[PDB]
């Protein structure tokens, strides 16, 4: 979907980019091997520093969820 | 270590050395240790350095 | 290798060098242009 565009029009590269970058740099994944071959499983490495980084990254988020009023601090991914 | 094809020539001196205050490894002992070298702690240790 | 010296060095140990050193890097020299194009930058290997 679109990637037959991504080849053509730079201004659209220049988005697809854009996210796909900050997205390894910030959850560590690229969707321009995402949609190209739509895997089963996809599987994250956290590593060095940019592994953390991005782990809590991942575990930086919360489910807040309106139950008594409360805005519950509710874990995102729990297995993290 | 002891048993191996390296040093096991060498075997028959390893109970004169411990004398000195010193420790030979069994294989299995030796493995104990750089698998103890894979332990989670170690791991980030060494990504970092 | 056992009981070679110095003038006793020839290819069997010629050999070995390029077992361990020369091989094992371009070994390990051989991993990373296997991630590096897949972009693996936080599942790295340790070496022992």
Not at chain 1, 66 to 77: A, C, N, P, S, W
Request: aromatic share 6%; charged share 25%; proline share 2%.
């Amino acid at each position: 979907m679109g990637m037959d565009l991504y080849k053509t029009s730079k201004a659209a590269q220049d988005v697809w980019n854009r996210a796909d970058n900050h997205f390894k740099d910030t959850y560590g994944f690229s969707i321009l091997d995402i949609v190209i071959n739509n895997p089963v499983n996809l599987t994250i490495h956290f590593g060095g520093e940019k592994g953390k980084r991005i782990r809590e990254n991942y575990s930086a988020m919360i489910f807040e969820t309106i139950v008594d009023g409360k805005l519950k601090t509710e874990k995102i991914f729990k297995e993290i | 270590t002891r048993g191996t094809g390296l040093m096991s020539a060498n075997n028959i001196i390893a109970e004169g050395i411990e004398k000195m205050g010193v420790r030979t490894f069994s294989q299995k002992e030796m493995a104990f240790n750089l698998l103890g070298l894979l332990t989670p702690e170690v791991v980030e240790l060494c990504q970092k350095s | 290798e056992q009981g070679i010296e110095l003038e006793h060095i020839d290819s069997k140990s010629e050999f070995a060098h390029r077992i361990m050193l020369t091989n094992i890097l371009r070994m390990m020299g051989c991993v990373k242009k296997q991630k590096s194009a897949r972009g693996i930058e936080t599942r790295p290997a340790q070496v022992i």
